[PDB]
Each structure stands twice: as C-alpha cells, then as structure tokens.
Structure 1
C-alpha cells in the first residue's frame, strides 16, 4: 500500500517543500532521514515521528540496506553529490528518486543509470512539473492537435540569486550555473511540450565576472533548439532576472503558463480560435509534489517504468553539454 521514503539531504527543498507533502500521498510514507547534520536528525525526526533507528548520518547511510521500512531513497543534495548518493542507495538495494539536475555530466548520469540497473532498482528524476495540472493540460492540448504542429516554444526560467557563498555558485558542488539549476526547466519543458529531442543547439552566455556571485559559474545562458519536426525553441536561463514561463505555439493557436513551473500559482492562457482567454486545467487527484512521490511508489508496486526515469535526466544532460559547447565554441552544435 505505502512504500517508505528515506529523505537524504535535509535542506530547503527537502524540509520546506517535499516532507510536508507526504500528507496527501496515497502510496508513499516518510520512513527515514539521512543527514550530515545531527541536529536536523533530532529536529525533523521529532517533528515527523521518525525513531532513532531510522535516522542516518552520511557515515552510517550504507546500513540502510538492513532497514526493510525503506524502499526508496530521495536524494536532495547539491548536484555534484547526486551520483555518489544514488549509487550508494542502489547498492543498499533501494529504489532512487533523484532531484534535478540529475548529475554534472552525461557520463555521471550513465553511471547512475547503470548502478540502478545492476541493483534491479528503479530510478526517477524529480521533474515535478510532469505532475502539475497546468503543465499536463498544455501537453495534452499539444498532443490532441489543438495547436496544429508545434512551431515555437518560447520559455524563460530564472531567478535573482543572492548569497555568493551558497553551493549553487560553487562549481565543485553545483556542476554549473543557472542552466544546471533553473534553465533546465526551459530545456525540460521544450522537450515535453514538443515530445521530441533536439537535433541542433545554439547558445549565448552573458556573465559579469566582476559580480561576487559569478566567479565560477554562469549567470545567463540562453539557447535555441531545433527539433526533427521543424519545431523550434528559444530558451532563457538566468541567475540575474526573475522569469518562469512558457508559450507553445502552432498555426492554429497557442497556450502559455506564467508562472509555469513554480511551486504554486500557475496561471494558463490560451489562444485557440479566438482572442486569448484564461484556461483552467482539468483537476488532478493531488498536488504535483505528492503526485511525484506516489508516481515512483506506484511504478514499483505495478512493475512499470517512471515517466521521468534516469533516461529523461540523461537526455537533459546531453543537451546541457551541447548548450555549454555551443556557447563556448560560438557555433551550432548538432545532436
């Protein structure tokens, strides 16, 4: 009925966003905590009724293999740590939910996929937008042919990042800048809205290296995608402006969401045979976070593959590598 989650990395997303949302889950429960901060184990163990036997440090984490209440490890650490904790979780016989971006590189994703396959365990990447009501509505409008063939996707993701000392601005822990953290939503959306994989990539980077935030990673890196159908995407990724939106357009009309992939507050507008009008999406059973959690559990219960498996995360990293290359080399990169 309910599979047990171990949450690993008790930072902002784990504690403010994910852990409260087991409340609306139907097939998932909070079973264990893994943290490098003993104080957090006490604080959250007490809040959520997690016994000391089900609390782990990073030093004792591998012992989770012996805990049958844990089915899934949800890795919610800085990006460069996704690969080793995923592999350790897999060797501990656990299924894995891994936050985006999946890892720093293509090779690292391949390694993760291989370790989970070797363990005979499922791997899913935290693309919660695939469970969000408005995003699902947009995807379905496209698939139903409401727009005709997709011609353009224009999508902007970014926020004004603050503290220079934080791990996202540290290349060794983040793997890269805005593209790794928030621009990936633009890429991921261009992919699920078209339902295609890009065959050509352009990119331009713009970073003020005198800014205390941007000594190591990039601020803005905007990119263009071409798809086999002829569909195109213009994407923004930024750490110096606030944006969160996409519009997908075809000859028969368009639909947009703004904000598109935020935690809440989505608003959709469509232009489909008349002037633009607000469009309310079909109701979903539960919020995107609880839905994401239950999706992995239900896949395990039914022996099915997640809609956003390791291969989806790998496909993003492939294009991300090409985006960085296109900007570096000032040429169109073919995929």
Structure 2
C-alpha cells in the first residue's frame, strides 16, 4: 500500500539498480522510506535528494558513512554497490548499529559472507540479501502450485538467464572487472537460475557439474566468464541444467518438469511482467514487497525470508560450480545447508 512511514532507509550507491528500480520502489511501500543517501558523487546525490525529497543534510559520502550511527532516523541501510564492496559496508553499517539490506550476490567470497553474518550477530541486527524474486507474486505462485503437487514428482529443471554486456554502461564496467564482480555471468545473473532452481524444487543440490567458455577475442571477457553451463543433481533424484550468458540478449526462462505436468516461467525473474503457465499431457510489486519485508521483520521482530545464510549458500554453490567448471569433474555439495522457514 502507497503511503509509507516508519522504517528509515539509507540508500548506498546511486547507480542503475538503485535509481531505476529501488528508489521508485518506495512509492508502493507501507513502512519503508528514503531517509538518507550515501554517494561518492555530491552533485548526483544532490539531484536525487531533491527528487525524492530527502533532507540534503542526510547525504553522506563513503568516508563519513559511519556517522549514520548518530542518526536514529536511519533504521537500515540498503547496499547497492558493486559485489566486492558489499561486505565492507554491511560490516561498517552493523558497527554503526543499523540493519542491512544487501544486494546479490552477497559477497565475492564465502569468507566475506561469513564475516558479514558474524558482524550482524555481534550487533544483534538483521541481515537481508536483496533477492526480489522471493517477494514476487508470480514466483511465489509458482512455488505454491509445486507444493500443492500440481506438477507431480519433480524430475527436470531447466533455467537460462542472459543479457548483453555493454562496456559503455558504467554499471556494466565493474561487472567486467574480476575483483569488483568476483566472477562473470554466474555471479551476476546465473545466480537467479541457481537460486530459483533451489526454491522451485525446495531442495539443495548434492552434486554439481559445469563447463565455461568465452571467446578469447572478446575484450569483455578477458577476466570474467561470458557463458557458463552447470548441471545439478538433488537428493530427491531431481536433476537440472541451466546456463548464464553475458553475450546473448535478455532471457529469463525457467522450466520445471514433473511426471504430472510441466511449469513454465518466462519471463521468470524480470523487473516488471513475469508470466507462468502449466502444461499437462492483488499483490504488491517485488521491489516494494522486499523493502517492507525488512521493515516488517524489524518492526515486528520476526525472521526474514532472505537471510544472510541464504546469500552465503548461493555464493558457496557458485564457488563449487566454478570449481567444477575448472576441473571438469563433479563437485560434492552435500554440506548440510538448511533453509530457514522454507524456500
């Protein structure tokens, strides 16, 4: 519902996602509000502040970021910086006594994910990873009918997530630098397929195989991978195969095959219009629903559906896939992860 209030957010990094999807996302919020902005660009932030009606005194840069602990109005921070920088600021945010909303991927290494979780506990503050698909009506509906056994026993999941990378786009420049992104299309978007396969099935992969290829003559992939294909096996016996691509156009298509029916999501994880059907032989926008979820969780002191642990699980699975792709051997992933209150 429109009119917002309570929970106060500090947006960090005025980039493509922050400005195109997140800030506009408050409009449909019931508890969340843009209280402050953190940016290394005074001029840009000054323009954003005027637009969303943010008190210009609430514009911090990356150096004085920490001073936000002095403002009770700021309840949480939403980190929308490159991957490599997620950990540092989530941690600095916790030491400042704030809750953290962090975008995906959680961090560029599993150790950092853990440090983030440790810092959160230490401060007794919640850590939520920005998985919008966990609050998307369509995606939830899909998860519902699968739980209501509408597809039968699940046996084959297929996913594909792609997008052409444009080196001129500032946002896509750091995605091509290994240290900033920590990986290629898998880290960036293949993660949606990986994460969806997991919640669509309601299980964890116990084994993984992968392969990756990139045109050695393409300047975009000198450091990170363009296309990568991973195949997984689950305890239930369900199997899956998906890929990510940085050189083919927009694709967000999932498929779940059961012996009763087949589910088709496509677009499956887009920003606006997702469509899902089933073939046999009324809701707030994911962006708004996510922002207010952390608000709800904090205000009503109840668990978040996308906890730091969840973020960690994906990164760890991605490092296993990267390893499989590297050795060309199957990688054991049966390490006992357990999902909080369900997928």
Write out per-residue CA displacement over residues 241-266 of structure 1, whole angstroms, 9 at most, x where no aligned residue: 13211011111101111111010121
Post-superposition Cα deviations, 1:200-249, rounded to whole Å, max 9, x if no partner, equal 00001011122010110000111011111111111111111132110111
Alignment of 1:33-52 (within 5 A): 33-52=37-56
Corresponding residue number in structure 2 for 1:295 = 293
**2:319 partner SS:** helix
1:330: which partner in 2? 328
Residues 82, 180 of structure 2: 8 Å contact kept: yes
Q: Name the residue aligned to 1:140.
A: 144
The answer as to 2:263 corresponding to 1:255 is: yes
Instruction: Give the deviation of 1:2 after TM superposition.
Output: 1.9
> 1:265 & 1:52 partners in 2: Cα distance?
35
In structure 1, which of residues 37, 43, 56 is the aligned counterpart of residue 60 of structure 2?
Answer: 56
1:245 to 253, 267, 270: 253
Aligned length: 325
Structure-1 residue corresponding to 2:341: none
Following the alignment from structure 1 to structure 2, what is the Cα–Cα distance between the partners of residues 60 and 108?
22
Q: CA deviation at 1:27?
A: 1.2
Any gaps of 5 or more consecutive residues in structure 2? 334-343
Following TM superposition, the consecutive aligned residue runs of length 4 or more in structure 1 with deviations greater than 3 angstroms are none
- For 1:184 and 1:26, the matched residues in 2 are separated by 29
Output the TM-score relative to the length of structure 2: 0.93
Of 217, 220, 223, which aligns to 1:216?
A: 223
User: Which residues of 2 match residues 171-190 of structure 1 at below 5 A?
Assistant: 171-190=178-197
More deviation, 291-300/141-150: 141-150
CA–CA distance in structure 1, aligned partners of residues 262 and 158 of structure 2? 11
Find the aligned partners of 2:162 and 2:299 in 1 and give their Cα distance: 36
Alignment partners' CA distance in 2, 1:98 and 1:170 = 20
- CA contact under 8 A between 2:208 and 2:321: conserved in structure 1? yes
How far the C-alpha of 1:147 sits from its partner, in A, is 1.0
Does residue 95 of structure 2 align to residue 91 of structure 1?
A: yes
Instruction: Quote the residue 1:280 is aligned against.
Output: none
1:195 is matched with which residue? 202
Q: Does the 8 Å contact 2:35/2:55 carry over to 1?
A: no
Give unpaired runs (5+ residues) of structure 1: 275-282
User: In the alignment, what sits opposite 2:232?
Assistant: 225
Q: CA deviation at 1:53?
A: 2.2
Match of 2:132 in 1: 128
Please say if 1:168 is aligned against 2:166: no
Paired residue for 1:9?
13
Tell me the distance in 1 between the aligned counterparts of 2:12 and 2:109: 21
Q: Tell me how far apart the structure 2 counterparts of residues 151 and 141 of structure 1 sit (CA, whole Å).
A: 15
Q: Is the 8 A contact 2:83 2:180 kept in 1?
A: yes
3-state DSSP of counterpart to 2:20: helix
Could you tell me how far 1:52 is from its partner in structure 2?
2.4
